[PDB]
């Protein structure tokens, strides 16, 4: 199957423009790739559910859009290197959200045998990639404070210890969180982060080990990497 | 525009259940229906296209049926892993639309929280803000209460909490409750308290510490 991979999100202020990428790899029946399909951008604002913004042929025609993002976004892809883009102007903060690029079932063009299916079908999709976040806003990247959760004497529950990180303070969504450098997995649970008075998020990751930890906090707006150790008080 | 309307809006169901979804469209759409699969922080995945057709891959105890304005999504047997959001999404005309979803929820056996506290760490203190942070983990069902008590003082408006989606395994959730106060207060008391009531537990449990110990 055809894979996609976007990228290209970030924080931006109101009125700013952004280019968002989206690279196909994989391949299909008869050995397609991502060029033989339509495909179409879709997003999902923060809680919200999913709103299909834009849609190109295989070719780079036969292109629309809705009506939200009609005259500020543009749709097109360079075959060659099998890479879909969205150029976005004058973003406004309702803008916010996670962008997806999908790509529609129907085969639609063959270049090798100068085929091209007559008609748009913009059937189901069948392939989306992981998405890339985008935040409009006028507010300052901030990046997290991480301070260990310590587990202590009397902390056992159940027959096993709990030990943590609380990544506190920052702005905006999202931070990835893992742990030892992603050699511990079990029993990880990173919570939605939640948003403080002060205008800034707050979220714990925590570990249960029975009866070395370090975590590795990560927040690309601000360009943060911190690896904490955790140790008991 | 075509407005596809799903319920319910959120669907409880045991594991091995048959389970209905149902979506219906503003207008006739023939069969130009599809459905998606989404977990919490993924892509949507295909799971049925043109109404009654199972993409290649996905599980069999998935089917879908209906045809003009209503249609279903059928589960035949509902998994752990099967908990979500579901689309339905509409290709008789442009702009494409998807509904609001549907989202899944497993009922499952109680199981009672083992709960956790921690103090405010040294660095942190270092900086005038202390925060406090209690865990209550692998539990069900998700309703719980947390409480506060400083010093036996009951707490209220100075803390947040926060849920797991729905553990795709197990189906549990775990809670953190999180009691920020400023440098001089957390100096000013010493026993901190975490008191947790559910249904999984007889009778309320509490966790505590006091400070600088």
């Known amino acids: 199957q055809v894979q996609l991979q976007e990228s290209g999100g970030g924080l931006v202020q109101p009125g700013e423009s952004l280019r968002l990428s989206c690279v196909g790899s994989?391949?299909?029946?008869?050995?397609?790739?991502?060029?033989?399909?339509?495909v179409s951008w879709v997003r999902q604002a923060p809680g919200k559910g999913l709103e299909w913004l834009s849609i190109?042929?295989?070719?780079?025609?036969?292109?629309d859009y809705a009506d939200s993002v009609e005259g500020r976004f543009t749709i097109s892809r360079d075959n060659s290197k099998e890479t879909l883009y969205l150029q976005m102007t004058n973003l406004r903060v309702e803008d916010t959200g996670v962008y997806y690029c999908?790509?529609?079932?129907?085969?639609?063009?063959?270049?090798?045998?100068?085929?091209?299916?007559?008609?748009?079908?913009?059937?189901?999709?069948?392939?989306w990639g992981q998405g890339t976040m985008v935040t409009v806003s006028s507010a300052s990247t901030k990046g997290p404070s991480v301070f260990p959760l310590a587990p202590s004497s009397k902390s056992t529950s159940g027959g096993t210890a709990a030990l943590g990180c609380l990544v506190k303070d920052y702005f905006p969504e999202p931070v990835t969180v893992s742990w030892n450098s992603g050699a511990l997995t079990s029993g990880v649970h990173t919570f939605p982060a939640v948003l403080q008075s002060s205008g800034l998020y707050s979220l714990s990751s925590v570990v249960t080990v029975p009866s070395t930890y370090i975590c590795n906090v990560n927040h690309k707006p601000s360009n943060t990497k911190v690896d904490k150790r955790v140790e008991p008080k | 525009d075509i407005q596809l309307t799903q319920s319910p809006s959120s669907l409880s169901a045991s594991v091995g259940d048959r389970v209905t979804l149902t979506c219906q469209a503003s207008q006739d759409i023939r069969k130009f229906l599809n459905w998606y699969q989404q977990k919490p922080g993924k892509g949507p995945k295909l799971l049925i296209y043109?109404?009654?057709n199972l993409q290649r891959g996905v599980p069999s105890r998935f089917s879908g049926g209906g045809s003009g304005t209503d249609f279903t999504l059928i589960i035949s047997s509902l998994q752990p892993e099967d908990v979500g959001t579901y689309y339905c999404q509409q290709y008789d005309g442009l702009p494409f639309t998807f509904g609001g979803g549907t989202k899944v929820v497993i009922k499952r056996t109680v199981a009672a929280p083992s709960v956790f506290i921690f103090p405010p760490s040294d660095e942190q203190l270092k900086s005038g803000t202390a925060s406090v942070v209690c865990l209550l983990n692998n539990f069900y069902p998700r309703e719980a209460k947390v409480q506060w008590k400083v010093d036996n003082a009951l707490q209220s408006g100075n803390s947040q909490e926060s849920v797991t989606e729905q553990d795709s395994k197990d189906s549990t959730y775990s809670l953190s409750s999180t009691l920020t106060l400023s440098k001089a207060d957390y100096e000013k008391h010493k026993v901190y308290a975490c008191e947790v009531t559910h249904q999984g537990l007889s009778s309320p449990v509490t966790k505590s510490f006091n400070r600088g110990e």
């Open positions: 190109i042929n295989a070719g780079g025609g036969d292109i």
């Open positions: 994989g391949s299909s029946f008869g050995e397609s790739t991502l060029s033989y399909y339509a």
């Open positions: 043109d109404a009654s």
């Open positions: 999908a790509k529609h079932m129907s085969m639609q063009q063959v270049v090798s045998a100068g085929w091209e299916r007559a008609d748009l079908v913009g059937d189901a999709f069948d392939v």
